[PDB]
């Protein structure tokens, strides 16, 4: 009751976040990209690319777990779509090619939030030092272009876009 001294003892909605439900019409990844604070870098993507699926994911888990211990907020731990390349070698004493092997590439990305400017030297020092074997670390900014690769292709728009131009 209002007048009782025990008013508001059951208050809980200020403890949890609002947790906006994913509405059917309003479902959208609204990301307020933060850029250039006094000592906090923007949203960064830790692109880990390796040829072996097991090795790429194993180091991806280490990066994600390391951030949690270091109080680094991790927005997502998604995975870039894989790319497959047909390795063709040239035949000796000839010119016609032959199918040598089928090698694929696997990319795992651990998106991270802002970090203190001092911690940038320390955090990256641990990462690049622990690159197991052939893992191509790539810490780039989280631009929408770097995030466009996760989606599909839309030739229906490209038919319109070409005619618009």
């Amino acid at each position: 009751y209002r007048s009782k001294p025990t008013h508001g003892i059951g208050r809980y909605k200020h403890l949890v976040k609002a947790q906006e439900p994913k509405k059917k019409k309003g479902k959208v990844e609204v990301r307020p990209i933060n850029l250039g604070t006094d000592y906090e870098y923007g949203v960064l993507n830790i692109h880990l690319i390796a040829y072996d699926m097991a090795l790429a994911e194993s180091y991806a888990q280490y990066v994600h777990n390391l951030c949690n211990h270091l109080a680094i907020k991790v927005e997502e731990s998604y995975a870039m779509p894989t790319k497959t390349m047909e390795v063709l070698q040239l035949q000796e004493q000839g010119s016609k090619m032959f199918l040598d092997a089928v090698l694929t590439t696997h990319e795992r990305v651990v998106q991270i939030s802002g970090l203190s400017a001092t911690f940038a030297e320390i955090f990256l020092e641990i990462i690049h030092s622990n690159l197991p074997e052939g893992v191509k670390l790539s810490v780039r900014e989280h631009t929408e272009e770097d995030f466009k690769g996760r989606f599909k292709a839309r030739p229906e728009l490209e038919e319109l876009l070409a005619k618009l131009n």
């Binding site: 209002r2 007048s3 009782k4 001294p5 025990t6 008013h7 508001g8 003892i9 208050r11 809980y12 200020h14 403890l15 949890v16 976040k17 109080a71 907020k73």
Partner: peptide
């Protein structure tokens, strides 16, 4: 006519602001 509580409130120790910094329960046990 609001009255003053006779002692400390239960959940007033934790900070309402900066919710993400506070570690959650994550468990029911």
């Amino acid at each position: 006519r609001r009255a003053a509580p006779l002692g400390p409130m239960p959940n007033e120790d934790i900070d309402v602001s900066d919710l993400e910094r506070l570690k959650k329960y994550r468990s029911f046990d």
